[PDB]
Amino acid sequence: THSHGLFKKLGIPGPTPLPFLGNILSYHKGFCMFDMECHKKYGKVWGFYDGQQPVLAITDPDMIKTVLVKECYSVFTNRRPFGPVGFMKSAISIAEDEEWKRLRSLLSPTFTSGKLKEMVPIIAQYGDVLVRNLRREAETGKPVTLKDVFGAYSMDVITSTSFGVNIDSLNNPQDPFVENTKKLDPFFLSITVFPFLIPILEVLNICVFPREVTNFLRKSVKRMKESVDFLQLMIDSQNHKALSDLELVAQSIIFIFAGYETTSSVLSFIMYELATHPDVQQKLQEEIDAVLPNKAPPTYDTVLQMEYLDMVVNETLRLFPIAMRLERVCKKDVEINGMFIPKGVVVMIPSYALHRDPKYWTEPEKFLPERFSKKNKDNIDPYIYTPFGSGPRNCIGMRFALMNMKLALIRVLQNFSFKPCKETQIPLKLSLGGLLQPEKPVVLKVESR
Amino acid sequence: THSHGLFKKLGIPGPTPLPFLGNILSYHKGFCMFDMECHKKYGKVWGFYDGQQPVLAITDPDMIKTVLVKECYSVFTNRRPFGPVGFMKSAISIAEDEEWKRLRSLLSPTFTSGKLKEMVPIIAQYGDVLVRNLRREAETGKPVTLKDVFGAYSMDVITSTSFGVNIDSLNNPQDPFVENTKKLDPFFLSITVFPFLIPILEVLNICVFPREVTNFLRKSVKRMKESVDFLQLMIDSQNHKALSDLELVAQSIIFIFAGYETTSSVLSFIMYELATHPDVQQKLQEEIDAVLPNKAPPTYDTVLQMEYLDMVVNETLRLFPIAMRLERVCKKDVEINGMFIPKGVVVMIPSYALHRDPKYWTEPEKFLPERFSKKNKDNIDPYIYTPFGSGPRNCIGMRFALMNMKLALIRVLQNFSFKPCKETQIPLKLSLGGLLQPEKPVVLKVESR
Ligand code: HEM
Numbered sequence: 092t093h094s095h096g097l098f099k100k101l102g103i104p105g106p107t108p109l110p111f112l113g114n115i116l117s118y119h120k121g122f123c124m125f126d127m128e129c130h131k132k133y134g135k136v137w138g139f140y141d142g143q144q145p146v147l148a149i150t151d152p153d154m155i156k157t158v159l160v161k162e163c164y165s166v167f168t169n170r171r172p173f174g175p176v177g178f179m180k181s182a183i184s185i186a187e188d189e190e191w192k193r194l195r196s197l198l199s200p201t202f203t204s205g206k207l208k209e210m211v212p213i214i215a216q217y218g219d220v221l222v223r224n225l226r227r228e229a230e231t232g233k234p235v236t237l238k239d240v241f242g243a244y245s246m247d248v249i250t251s252t253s254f255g256v257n258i259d260s261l262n263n264p265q266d267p268f269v270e271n272t273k274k275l276d277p278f279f280l281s282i283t284v285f286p287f288l289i290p291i292l293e294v295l296n297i298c299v300f301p302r303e304v305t306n307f308l309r310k311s312v313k314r315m316k317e318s319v320d321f322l323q324l325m326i327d328s329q330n331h332k333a334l335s336d337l338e339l340v341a342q343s344i345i346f347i348f349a350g351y352e353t354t355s356s357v358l359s360f361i362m363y364e365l366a367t368h369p370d371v372q373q374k375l376q377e378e379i380d381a382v383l384p385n386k387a388p389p390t391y392d393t394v395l396q397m398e399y400l401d402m403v404v405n406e407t408l409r410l411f412p413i414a415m416r417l418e419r420v421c422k423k424d425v426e427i428n429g430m431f432i433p434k435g436v437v438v439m440i441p442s443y444a445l446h447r448d449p450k451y452w453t454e455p456e457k458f459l460p461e462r463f464s465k466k467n468k469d470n471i472d473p474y475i476y477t478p479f480g481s482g483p484r485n486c487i488g489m490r491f492a493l494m495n496m497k498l499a500l501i502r503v504l505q506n507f508s509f510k511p512c513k514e515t516q517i518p519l520k521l522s523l524g525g526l527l528q529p530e531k532p533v534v535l536k537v538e539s540r
Numbered sequence: 541t542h543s544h545g546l547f548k549k550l551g552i553p554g555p556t557p558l559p560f561l562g563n564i565l566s567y568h569k570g571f572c573m574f575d576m577e578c579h580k581k582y583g584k585v586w587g588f589y590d591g592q593q594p595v596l597a598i599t600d601p602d603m604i605k606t607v608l609v610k611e612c613y614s615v616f617t618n619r620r621p622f623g624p625v626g627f628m629k630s631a632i633s634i635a636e637d638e639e640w641k642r643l644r645s646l647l648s649p650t651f652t653s654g655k656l657k658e659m660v661p662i663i664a665q666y667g668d669v670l671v672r673n674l675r676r677e678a679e680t681g682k683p684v685t686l687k688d689v690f691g692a693y694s695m696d697v698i699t700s701t702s703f704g705v706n707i708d709s710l711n712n713p714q715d716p717f718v719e720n721t722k723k724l725d726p727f728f729l730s731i732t733v734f735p736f737l738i739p740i741l742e743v744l745n746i747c748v749f750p751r752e753v754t755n756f757l758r759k760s761v762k763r764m765k766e767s768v769d770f771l772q773l774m775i776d777s778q779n780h781k782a783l784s785d786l787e788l789v790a791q792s793i794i795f796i797f798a799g800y801e802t803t804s805s806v807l808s809f810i811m812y813e814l815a816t817h818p819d820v821q822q823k824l825q826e827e828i829d830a831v832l833p834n835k836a837p838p839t840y841d842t843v844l845q846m847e848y849l850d851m852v853v854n855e856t857l858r859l860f861p862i863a864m865r866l867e868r869v870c871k872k873d874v875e876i877n878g879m880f881i882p883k884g885v886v887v888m889i890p891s892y893a894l895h896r897d898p899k900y901w902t903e904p905e906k907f908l909p910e911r912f913s914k915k916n917k918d919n920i921d922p923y924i925y926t927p928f929g930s931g932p933r934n935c936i937g938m939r940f941a942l943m944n945m946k947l948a949l950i951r952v953l954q955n956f957s958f959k960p961c962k963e964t965q966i967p968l969k970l971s972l973g974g975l976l977q978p979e980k981p982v983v984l985k986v987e988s989r
């Protein structure tokens with residue numbers, strides 16, 4: 092309890108912390124529920140302790156803007172350091188200060204609309220592979236587990252977008268690439284109450300990324316150095332200061348994790364919503380059939396034209412912002428928008444909490460895509476709604492993730508309809524761990540149109 | 541052995557490191573001898589590993605200047621972090637980056653010539669107390685242990701210069717202040733090969749500063765908050781951003797350690813030299829008697845006029861630079877004077893090695909004060925001779941230490957002569973630990989004039 096007196100001496104309200112644990116025992120309902128309760132009983136700002144680490148939650152849109160945009164380069168540059176990371180300290184999302192800046196600048200041209208349009212034909216091919224595997228489990232008449240067919244699709248996209256390795260993950264059970272890209276809680280809570288043990292784990296070459304996948308990828312990069320995708324865009328860039336070969340492998344790993352779990356979990360949440368709201372699902376199929384008459388193939392320009400599709404994605408991401416929280420480490424004693432923030436505090440934006448706050452959303456628990464219609468979108472504050480973050484360190488893959496998910500949705504909805512069944516968890520409950528995912532896997536009935 | 545390939549891949553020569561240990565086993569002859577050998581068999585630049593930490597030694601005067609002066613604020617701002625330090629991370633010599641800058645700027649006016657002249661009458665009073673205790677152990681006809689009478693004197697000065705607590709440490713064996721200021725290797729080598737254990741020690745409130753002295757000092761500061769010296773100069777300053785009460789206590793502790801061990805060890809080395817060079821001792825007494833006729837009391841202006849005295853101090857500090865090494869942590873990938881220094885390397889200036897190099901000193905092992913005569917002082921390079929460091933982070937107490945030591949020397953030499961005897965270690969051997977101190981304590985015969 093050496094710093095458990097910081098928020099009292101600053102006059103900031105918060106939950107009283109236990110010795111050593113801080114407030115971590117309040118994470119037992121899940122930490123998005125912890126954030127809603129703290130927001131409800133403390134107001135606009137509050138403090139709590141992850142073990143000995145102080146964390147200041149902020150909910151004011153102006154303060155969020157100072158932190159994420161205004162004062163990003165000078166005070167709030169980095170995220171908080173986590174458990175044994177090893178050589179993945181070079182990954183863009185884990186790197187810090189001038190080193191992050193270099194990586195951000197080197198990887199920015201990789202995610203432009205120009206390059207994204209060149210990837211559309213490639214990821215559209217697996218759209219069709221998805222529809223192929225979907226027609227099959229629809230004949231079973233068995234409720235389908237969406238995270239499997241989506242999980243496989245998301246892997247197919249990422250493998251072919253990051254390395255050009257075209258594969259059918261669902262029908263090729265064990266390819267050296269598909270396997271290795273497949274093999275990837277208590278330890279996180281222990282680390283959080285035992286952060287002084289992270290240096291011991293690092294020196295012992297223990298790494299929260301399974302080191303066995305990482306040797307395989309470096310090899311594959313080598314057997315692909317001379318022998319359009321993210322690898323070449325990064326290799327051609329080497330042909331600031333240029334990237335290195337090992338740095339190359341760290342970014343790719345980050346892209347798989349992003350590409351795989353975020354894309355597959357968001358797509359599942361969407362089809363849950365479309366199944367439990369047949370009117371929305373019907374209206375979306377009518378917009379799709381009108382833009383793309385007679386199951387025509389989706390294109391970059393056609394996708395950017397589907398306003399209701401965009402509305403459904405945005406609203407799904409309001410209810411389930413898969414990063415849950417934004418965080419920045421306070422580098423130096425500062426005073427933002429009337430309050431003093433001392434060095435070393437983690438400032439956290441409770442995105443999940445803000446997305447479900449009645450101060451800004453009417454009926455926050457209701458799936459209502461019309462919030463994001465061109466009429467009501469103007470009243471939505473970009474620092475309350477922050478599914479991809481904001482400012483210089485926001486989600487670099489936002490445009491790629493949106494395109495990738497919409498391309499799957501179009502093709503899947505052109506051919507099938509999705510209905511609940513006796514195994515569907517209605518209402519959906521979220522897991523209580525540290526990931527935003529359903530408690531029970533989403534299972535739905537899939538009928539061919 | 542994760543980084544033991546850095547100096548090879550950079551083409552920098554050095555001793556081959558063992559796994560885990562690096563080169564620490566070479567510290568067995570002492571690390572000043574390690575630096576002389578490395579300088580002799582590698583040339584101007586070399587690399588070695590304190591466990592896993594790489595350290596680049598530089599001996600070029602130009603590069604030393606880029607590191608200590610030119611590029612201090614931007615790349616080489618801090619010293620290397622050491623073992624459990626606790627709240628002494630606020631001490632000026634341990635603090636880093638913008639935090640060090642604030643402390644440096646807040647404490648600079650405390651060490652000006654103006655304030656130093658105001659301290660002279662105070663520290664001259666213990667000069668006389670020293671002569672009193674010296675006349676006594678001279679009657680014993682017993683060889684005198686100089687570190688005792690000097691150690692006590694150095695404590696008397698520091699206590700009365702930092703807090704106004706006038707005392708006779710040698711004749712008042714146990715005063716609460718003298719005791720506490722008295723109670724203050726294997727663990728250092730273990731830490732160096734086990735740096736990942738420092739966070740474990742910190743969380744357990746284990747601190748290499750004996751925590752028992754530190755609670756007493758905070759109390760004393762309190763019983764001195766309302767109830768000319770370093771404390772008031774720092775308290776009056778509070779009446780950048782102002783200092784705090786706890787920060788106050790960290791700086792004072794640093795001043796005691798500096799004031800006590802450096803002053804007492806340098807004075808002993810001097811009187812060893814004056815005893816083993818009676819001609820120098822005689823000529824110095826003649827300069828003293830001429831400036832200060834008939835044992836007149838020393839003054840600020842009189843001390844700054846004694847050129848030979850200044851010459852003896854400077855030459856003693858050439859042979860025994862008590863900090864041994866200067867160090868700076870490289871904050872960012874840089875290229876200085878033709879060589880690339882990667883982030884996180886410790887750059888070390890081997891002051892002891894440079895002070896005894898034949899490239900710049902004729903007969904380096906000889907005690908020859910005339911090197912520093914007004915004729916030959918001009919040829920001495922201020923980046924080879926660096927007893928107090930150089931640049932913005934040099935010894936802030938240099939003028940105070942010089943005045944304090946000369947005032948002791950004048951008064952002691954006005955009354956006594958110092959001769960070797962059967963117990964004097966001739967030639968003097970240095971200890972092989974991590975401190976520059978004699979192997980056997982200096983003992984000399986002291987005769988009244
Ligand atoms: C629905 C899908 C996704 C969502 C909701 C999402 C959301 C986020 C969020 C909220 C952040 C934190 C931004 C901040 O701290 O302000 C982030 C960071 C990041 N995301 Fe995404 N992401 C998704 C998919 C992706 C994809 C597909 C990629 C790349 C292929 C990606 C790459 C990154 C990177 C590199 C960062 C760190 C940026 C930096 O540190 O500069 N994300 N993402």
Ligand code: HEM
Pocket residue numbers: 608632633634644794795798799802803806861862863866867926927928929930932933934935936937938940941
């Ligand atoms: C013979 C006596 C002394 C010698 C040879 C000496 C030498 C040194 C050296 C070599 C450094 C390192 C400078 C660098 O890294 O470039 C240093 C730092 C320092 N010394 Fe001294 N010192 C002595 C006495 C003192 C005294 C009496 C005080 C204060 C009362 C003092 C206060 C300091 C401080 C605060 C620093 C750190 C400065 C910073 O980090 O900005 N020293 N000293």
